[PDB]
Amino acid sequence: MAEEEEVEEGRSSSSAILDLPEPLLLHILSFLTDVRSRHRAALACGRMRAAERATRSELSLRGDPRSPGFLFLSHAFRFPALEHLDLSLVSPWGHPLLSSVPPCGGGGGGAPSASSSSGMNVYHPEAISEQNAFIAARLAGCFPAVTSLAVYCRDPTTLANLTPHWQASLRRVKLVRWHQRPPTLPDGADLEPLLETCAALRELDLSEFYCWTEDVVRALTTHPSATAALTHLDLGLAAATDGFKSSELGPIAASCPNLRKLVAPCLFNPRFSDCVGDDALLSLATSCPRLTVLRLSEPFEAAANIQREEAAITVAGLVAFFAALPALEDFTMDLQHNVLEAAPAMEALARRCPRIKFLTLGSFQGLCKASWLHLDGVAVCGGLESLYMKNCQDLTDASLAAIGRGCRRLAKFGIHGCDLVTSAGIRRLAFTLRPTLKEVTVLHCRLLHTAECLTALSPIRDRIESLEINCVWNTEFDDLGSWEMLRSLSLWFSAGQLLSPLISAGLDSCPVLEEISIKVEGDCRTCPRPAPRTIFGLSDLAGFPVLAKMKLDLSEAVGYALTAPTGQMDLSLWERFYLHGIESLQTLYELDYWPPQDKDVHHRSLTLPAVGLIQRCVGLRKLFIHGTTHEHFMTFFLSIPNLRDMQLREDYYPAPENDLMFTEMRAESWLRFEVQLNSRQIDD
Amino acid sequence: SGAKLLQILNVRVVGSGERVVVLSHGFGTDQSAWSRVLPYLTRDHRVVLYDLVCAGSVNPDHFDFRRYDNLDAYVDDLLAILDALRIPRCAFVGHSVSAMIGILASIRRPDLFAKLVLIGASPRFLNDSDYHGGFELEEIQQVFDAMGANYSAWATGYAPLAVGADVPAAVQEFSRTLFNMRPDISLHVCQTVFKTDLRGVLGMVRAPCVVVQTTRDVSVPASVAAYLKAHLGGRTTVEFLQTEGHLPHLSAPSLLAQVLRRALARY
Amino acid sequence: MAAEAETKAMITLRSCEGQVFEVAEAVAMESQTIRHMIEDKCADTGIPLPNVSAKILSKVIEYCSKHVEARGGAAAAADGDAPAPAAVEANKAVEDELKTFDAEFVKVDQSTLFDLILAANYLNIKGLLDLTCQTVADMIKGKTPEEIRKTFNIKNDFTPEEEEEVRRENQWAFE
């Protein structure tokens, strides 16, 4: 009797990670970057849900903020520690957000014949401002600590609505507009609300925000209080500009003594008197002596056949500019005109800017010659780690050896338009920089074909991590090692070129290859029609095991989108040709696609063969299409089990206007289809 | 109702001028086929554009097969739209089957259609005794078979034949609009159109008529323009464009815009 | 003159249960909490560790000594000059060795790994903390909350109406 003393092992062991003090968990999950795993863990438990909510710094809201579903989110949707807020991808894409400008609904130029009583939408500005304020208040409540903000701005009324809630903390702002600038806006008025409200601004970005340079000059030079305090600036303007002129840049420099980073395409064409000459260069240098990152470019069009003309910049001006700015570390100066004999300029750069680390030059001739007993030009800048070249028509293998001996700290190397470079010099540079060289870029080198270049990179093939190449196929089996560190690859293809030879050229085994981008360039209409069974060779890339991210840009591939004359090939068949074999990518997790553009159609429209080709990639989690399509193609993709992040990004200037006139995708169809997609039960 | 049909058929009001003009597109097309020529009349006329129920732009769910087996329901949609727009009087410019639609409407409502401008008009397509519609029953049935067996292949083989002139942009636009069509709806409405014979009702058309005939039309023999000018009851005139094809609104906008602005000066 | 052997200063460690560990001060140097008390000169008699047991203390000593050894063996740069290509290769190997040492170092049971997490915090050993802190993050990586619940032996605490609601609210997680 009793005979009962042997049941004392039932104590539930607690997960001691929960027993940790909470700041420790906050510290641990401060390291977690991938939002997927973040929110997976947040769904594991409520305490972890709170931890993940408190550990978030950046966020891009997906869906319609105007939708009451986002508006009526509970107090749990709270992000006090959210710093970076991205509102440029909210639904619908490409639309004015919180815009106070009334919709142009039936406003054709003409006096309305006032004999008609049916359904006129009477505009109510009071209500409009009401929802604008309420949505802004909700956004501030969810995201109170926003200091770096990205937003799509069709009109500055969006900015006027958004600024008061974060004006005290907002230090960096990113503006987005691929649509045309509103012609009725006063010059500089797009930027005035920020120059008036956000006193904390320290970085400004307008690389892709389409606008005129004159707007910039007006807004900036007339707001010296704000311009004296900015630290970072970008002026790409969607690269839809011919480039800033000297007269524009000058007063800008005057109003801004405190800049540190600049990116700006500029008018460097010497045939314009208002081109950027050495005088403007030194005026900028004097005006902003503290500069650290400078990326300056000459906008150009493809019709500019071999720009043999010289630029408006002299080597003496380059030397003086280097002297006037000792604080530089990142530099980009890309020109289509040639600057001759800039090696003494490079010497002055090295001497006056010992902190130089990143260098990018275009069409600069005679930078390194190795023509003397000493290293020359860039070969002396031993502190360089980054080096990209464009249109160096006179760069030699001896120049490569001199650079490698000097720039022993060079980690990333790049040449473009360097016709005199052979595989011997490439192999020598790879061997010399083998411990340090990790990235190499070769584009449109005439002698450097794919197989020779891949063979010449054997010394660093075990160490190379990212690669960019334009593919040129020519008309013992030594064990070429797998690309053990190569995780990223960039590919450039002529129209009609085949991807299949790439695996044979030396790129067969890339066990760590995670992401790849393929760019296809050329006029498909002039290209002969390939055989009906010809494919690009996407299936040939399945040999890469961790291949997850894809970026196939065919927007530059221009063809008769829907019907070619007899003997030629339409972009429907072209999409079938290029996208064939994509389903072979088992781990394909992310795809970025650019629909090919037809000149006759403002739209890069997707054809059904592409729909069928993509729909069968079950592993695709993320799909970003840079164009438009039919509404009837949309329901197919609900069959793909796993996709959520799908947005038609007409992010190419000019963004076409979507106003109830096109058979292509509509906004209401877009919202209801997002409801359809988020209605599917998804994997966890 | 007319008001919801405005949204359904994408009815939009643009332009200015006391002169009201109604544009109706043709087979495998929509109201944007008039975009290349839309500005030319916006100055002088208040322009009305709408989408037929068969266009892929309209929800294919809205296509009533059984009511839309005759041009009568399409005329009904046009008339409901115009009544919803309180238009008591207007001119009509029709393309392809839209010309038959306008013929039937002016027969039904002569008070509304002041003048008619016809681009590629045909009251009947099947050749008859003393009648060359340009097509035989075997050809039409072969077209049906080619489209049903492969709408893609038929449309690719058809669109350059329809556009005619070597203008890849217009052929591309027509290919887009044609491919946006739904195959079952398309077979239905093509059966609707080829079977339509308005030769007995042209004389009832009271309104002055403007026939636009091209140099070479794959579906419209020049004798069809002669028949139209002969049988239409209204004062009928034929304008000949120095271009070939069936859709000049996409291929030669200049010539057709000239003809239209000449016609729409007074009516 | 007899060669004076450099005597690595020994800091006496007294674990929670009373066990003593003799380590170099450079090992005791890493732990900031231990580091701070060293300069407080209260380490002459040994420091108490009432929250650290002998096993966790020994493994922490192992980790800290290994990382100090890696620091010492790393080819130090010659006064402002970038290391020679040979020197870069030597240091790259030590990191790879130390990182490899780290991966199996946290290849312990959850409780010990959980215990590894606590001690590095109490000892303010960030390297050990981060290695153990991210170790849990990887073993949570790639999992749904359910098998996560079993993996930590967590009972799922969400009512079906709550867990349904929260799953759909967070649909942008898995996708």
Residue numbers in the entry:
A (entry chain A): 1 to 475, 512 to 720
B (entry chain C): 52 to 318
C (entry chain B): 1 to 175
The authors write:
Here, we found that apo-D53 was rather flexible and reconstituted the holo-complex containing D53, S-phase kinase-associated protein 1 (SKP1), D3 and D14 with rac-GR24. The cryo-electron microscopy (cryo-EM) structure of SKP1−D3−D14 in the presence of D53 was analyzed and superimposed on the crystal structure of ASK1−D3−AtD14 without D53. After 3D classification, a subset of 42,499 particles remained and was used for reconstruction, yielding a final cryo-EM map with a resolution of 7.09Å estimated by the gold Fourier shell correlation standard. D14, D3 and SKP1 had good fits to the refined map. Unfortunately, front, tilted and side views of the cryo-EM map did not reveal the location of D53. Unfortunately, D53 was too flexible to capture in a certain form, and the electron density information was lost during average and classification processing. No large conformational rearrangement was observed between the structures of the two complexes. Compared with the ASK1−D3−AtD14 complex, D14 in the SKP1−D3−D14 complex was flipped away from D3 at ∼9Å. Although the density does not have enough details to allow for accurate fitting of the SKP1−D3−D14 structure and the approximate 9Å rotation may relate to the difference in D14 proteins from rice and Arabidopsis, the local conformational differences are still possibly associated with the formation of holo-complex. The protected regions of D14 and D3 mainly lie around the interfaces of D14 and D3 in the SKP1−D3−D14 complex, suggesting that D53 may also bind the interfaces of D14 and D3 in a manner dependent on the SL-induced D14−D3 assembly.
Strigolactones (SLs) play fundamental roles in regulating plant architecture, which is a major factor determining crop yield. The perception and signal transduction of SLs require the formation of a complex containing the receptor DWARF14 (D14), an F-box protein D3 and a transcriptional regulator D53 in an SL-dependent manner. When the SL level is low, D53 interacts with the transcriptional repressor TOPLESS through its EAR motif and inhibits downstream gene expression. D53 belongs to the AAA+ ATPase family and comprises four distinct domains: the N-terminal region, the D1 ATPase domain, the bridge M domain and the D2 ATPase domain.
